[PDB]
Paper text:
Membrane transporters belonging to the ubiquitous divalent anion/Na+ symporter (DASS) family move Krebs cycle intermediates or sulphate across the cell membrane typically by utilizing the preexisting Na+ gradient. However, like other well-characterized bacterial DASS proteins, VcINDY is known to transport succinate and other C4-dicarboxylates, rather than citrate (C6-tricarboxylate)1319. Our structure reveals a homodimeric arrangement, with each VcINDY protomer comprising eleven membrane-spanning helices (TM1–TM11), two re-entrant helix-turn-helix hairpins (HPin and HPout) and two interfacial helices (H4c and H9c). Viewed in parallel to the membrane, the VcINDY dimer is shaped like an inverted bowl with its concave mouth facing the cytoplasm, allowing the aqueous solution to reach the midpoint of the membrane.
To uncover how VcINDY distinguishes between C4-dicarboxylate and C6-tricarboxylate, we determined the structure of a citrate-bound VcINDY. Citrate inhibits the VcINDY-mediated succinate transport, likely as a competitive inhibitor. In the citrate-bound VcINDY, the side-chain amide of N151 and the side-chain hydroxyl of T152 donate H-bonds to a terminal carboxylate (pro-R) of the bound citrate, whereas the side-chain hydroxyl of S377 and the side-chain amide of N378 form H-bonds with the central carboxylate of citrate. Moreover, the side chains of P201, V322 and T379 make van der Waals interactions with the bound citrate. One terminal carboxylate (pro-S) and the hydroxyl of citrate, however, make no interaction with VcINDY and project towards the solvent. More importantly, our co-structure indicated that the citrate- and succinate-binding sites overlap substantially in VcINDY, and that citrate inhibits the transport of succinate by preoccupying the substrate-binding site, that is, as a competitive inhibitor. In our VcINDY structures, the two carboxylates of succinate occupy virtually the same position as the central and pro-R carboxylates of citrate. In the citrate-bound structure, the pro-S carboxylate, which probably carries a full negative charge (crystallization pH∼7), makes no interaction with VcINDY. Rather, P201, V322 and T379 pack against the bound citrate and steer the pro-S carboxylate away from the [name]. Therefore, the negative charges in citrate may not be fully ‘neutralized' by its interactions with VcINDY in the membrane bilayer. This finding may explain why citrate is less effective in inhibiting VcINDY-mediated succinate transport than C4-dicarboxylates and why citrate preferably binds to the inward-facing VcINDY.
Residue numbers in the entry:
A (entry chain B), B (entry chain A): 18 to 462
Write the structure that this text describes.
Amino acid sequence: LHRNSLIVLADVALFLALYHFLPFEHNVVLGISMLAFIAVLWLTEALHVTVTAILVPVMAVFFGIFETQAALNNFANSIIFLFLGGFALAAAMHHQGLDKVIADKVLAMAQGKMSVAVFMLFGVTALLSMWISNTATAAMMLPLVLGVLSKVDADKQRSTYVFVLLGVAYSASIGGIATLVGSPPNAIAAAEVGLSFTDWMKFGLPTAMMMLPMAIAILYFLLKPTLNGMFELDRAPVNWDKGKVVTLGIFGLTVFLWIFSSPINAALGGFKSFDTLVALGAILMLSFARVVHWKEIQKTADWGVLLLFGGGLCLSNVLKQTGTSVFLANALSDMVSHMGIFVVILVVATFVVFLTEFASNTASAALLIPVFATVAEAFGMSPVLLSVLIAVAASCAFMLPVATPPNAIVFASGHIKQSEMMRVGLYLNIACIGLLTAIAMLFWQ
Amino acid sequence: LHRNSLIVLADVALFLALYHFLPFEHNVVLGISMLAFIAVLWLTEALHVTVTAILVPVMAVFFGIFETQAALNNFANSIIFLFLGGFALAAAMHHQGLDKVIADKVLAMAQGKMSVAVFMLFGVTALLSMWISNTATAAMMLPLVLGVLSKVDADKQRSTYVFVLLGVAYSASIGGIATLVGSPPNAIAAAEVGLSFTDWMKFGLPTAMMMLPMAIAILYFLLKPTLNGMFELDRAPVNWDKGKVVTLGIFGLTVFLWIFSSPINAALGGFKSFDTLVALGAILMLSFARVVHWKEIQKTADWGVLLLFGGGLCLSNVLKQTGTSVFLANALSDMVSHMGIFVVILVVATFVVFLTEFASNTASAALLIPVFATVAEAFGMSPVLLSVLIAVAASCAFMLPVATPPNAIVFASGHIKQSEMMRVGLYLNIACIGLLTAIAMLFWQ
Ligand code: NA
Ligand code: NA
Ligand code: NA
Ligand code: NA
């Protein structure tokens, strides 16, 4: 009776159809049919992203592709735990309120100027997003933005207070491209191609550094009248209490080890997934240092995303084991050789940057990273490029709301028009397809 | 400065001490030192049960016992997922309110008699606990019990309204011994020795059936004046709405497949951990049937317990790999042959039934099931007996509160005395040591 119940039944139909009608070796048929089935369920979101994730192994198992335990073992990949470490690290500094103090201390550095208020509001939202979340960084920023844009209250003077709203919802999404913790897509790429924390930063941090100015520039040079206004610094000030310095200290130490993981680990006996150990170490230090309780981490952690990671890896393995990766490689063989590597990575970048407007950031990564990385491997090319690309572009949702929660958070502020966002994002999309295809060409040799 | 911070440092000291001073082959020393370290941390609970759980692999890995990924793979054991299925199954019928209707419909079957009120209150708390939880079943029952014992309000007439309070807190714990979902210890035993759902029910359901009458009898024949009183059936009645029949239907179907897993699976091609597939199948049916949202399951699920399971399995493997299981087998060799199998299982049953009063139900199972099952295996005896025993006995906390949350839930009802509980439990403990050692002898050949 419901929309989604039908999408599911139409997908069950589609599967059954593809299954019986495709004219290939049995494994490829099964692999293709499953790919389509999942593809639909993640893009439509007829079932919850995480329920679909769980659907992957239970199919794999019933269709004899894997044994139950083999399939499940995916959900215990070391990146999954690295991400759970980053969740606990966030939980700590939120419960501790170290996110508020980093906001106040930087925001009140700007004395009383709306010019240097919004510019510091974007610079914080981005720096906080590197470690925290997107949905979380955005929802935490909204009250602090509405606090500032209350002195220039005239909402017949909209474009002042739309620039600073749309500004953070993008700064949250762009800041999420800086490190391996931040936005799930990054983690899905890292789990797929086997990246370290310090690996993904060598890619993303440059891209975030480039894209934040470029995005502010584009919002600016549409309609900004904000070189005017004054501050209302209205609320109780902040102060470092029972080891907000400790939470910072652990955080600093953790982030330090993540960066210097390569020499530190090598000069320790070369442990296997060092970054993950550092991440689990963080959870231990944070608990021994009494600084955060476990009930907190259990609330903060998006276990649904952690389960998603696994289902996506399971999918990747279903494609390999059924030879569907090799089959598509053969099928695209003539096409990709008739295209350039420029042409390809332009098509890819474009495709996702717009697909991510209609569907979930991570759901899109969870579908496309496996398909592309595994096909790239059948071509015997390093799957890293295509994977990192997809993950960055999947976090480039700038048009409508519903694209990301950050977009829909500043939108519910009952002010910003549907039409307005749809055209700043349309420029910023292309702007990125440029920047990405640009950078993706430079990171080659 | 805090109590627990010291326990930790004293434990770190103890480890360091044992590590340097024990006069054995290196692996045994490391294995023993770790066993002690963990043993302390789980019994004291200086660190959260779950943080200690995470501490297991991170040690194993740093001390070269396992590779990071190998150690982590433990957290994806198929029983872990079976238990997550049971969490989602509970989440469904609570959000749906099917637990309330099963309470009302059975409670209002008793017309207006306090005699047949409390007797049906225990019979429900037990039947609900089989599937739901203990902490959850107890906290859900408290308002329904205080609702009944408000007509005999005279609390100078205490022993009427203490019998019916202490009664449910035990019915919740006893009902948790009926099936593999219910109380974590059961799952830790099942993961260790490789039990199916229908396996653990063949053991526990008999034991729950026996122990519930035996426990009521003991509370009764201390001070019961409850053959008197009348009902206040005060609140809005219940009615089957948007598929509370569906939730029941799925539940029934799920529980059906779990029972008949053996012939159904055999007549399907013999899939690997069928019960787990059924459990994950439940999560899918419940989502397709739209009957429960994922945000619900994410709140309901005790991810901390799911992580605990893994840490415990990891420990078990640390004992095997270091040969600490074989070493203790050799060390207890002369003692266990000088004892009977009666003597042993009497000592075991006694030991836990009283240990579980001072420390966490599952934390105790997580420590003792590995140690015993692995030592039993070094003696080349089926580890099932000792494991199932420990898991049942670990759920036999009847003395002080703080033993289980169910005990401390009816206790905060500002009425029941410390002294009172401590002596009904002391009888019931021995009563069980009897019943268990009894039953444990019968389930032999
Ligand atoms: Na982020
Ligand atoms: Na999106
Ligand atoms: Na239970
Ligand atoms: Na206990």
